[PDB]
Amino acid sequence: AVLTQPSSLSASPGASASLTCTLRGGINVVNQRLYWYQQKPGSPPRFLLKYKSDSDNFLGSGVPSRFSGSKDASANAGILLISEVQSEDEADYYCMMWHSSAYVFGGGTKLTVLGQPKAAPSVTLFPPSSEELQANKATLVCLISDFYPGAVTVAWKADSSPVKAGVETTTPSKQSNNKYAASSYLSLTPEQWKSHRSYSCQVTHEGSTVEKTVAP
């Protein structure tokens, strides 16, 4: 790997984060022009700065001065310095350089800004529509959103007993505003749906369990 960045990095607000970009052994970092990009989910990456040395660098317009570049010849690495880290700096950060006739990026470092407050999930459960039943299929959709942190356990219950067959649950992903949302689908036969008093989606988050229930 030409360029290697750590997978993840966590820093407290008001702290500084030193994002590393380690160049392969046989390529000396002292001479290299390094470029750093910021990407938030749902958007293309965004140029931050070039850094070759204290005399040769480039800071993109509208990019905070809190972003600065440096190099660590000992570790043969480039460094992105984020000072006074803020919640809105949470993103994936990419280093990049030209080498062997191509731009190459590192794998991206995901910055986690610590100290975001808890938020209780909003859960809505939909039964199978008549249209889908009429089509001889049945899907329960449980939608979970507005919660932080993103660790959620989702359980389905046919009547009052656990159900694991036919379940499809997405990995919670941050919607805009840095909160999380997730989806869980329970597929049934129309007969399974009509032979039970009800089905339940149960979402446990931060010491609390929301349960919605639907029935025919």
Binding site: Y35, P44, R46, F47, K50, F58, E131, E132
Partner: peptide
Amino acid sequence: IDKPFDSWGQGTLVTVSSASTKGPSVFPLA
């Protein structure tokens, strides 16, 4: 090129696959 990749498109997902395209069934969630 001091500022590579000044501006980007929104990105387009291209899927390479042997399988057939399939349109969705849309169901109202009342």
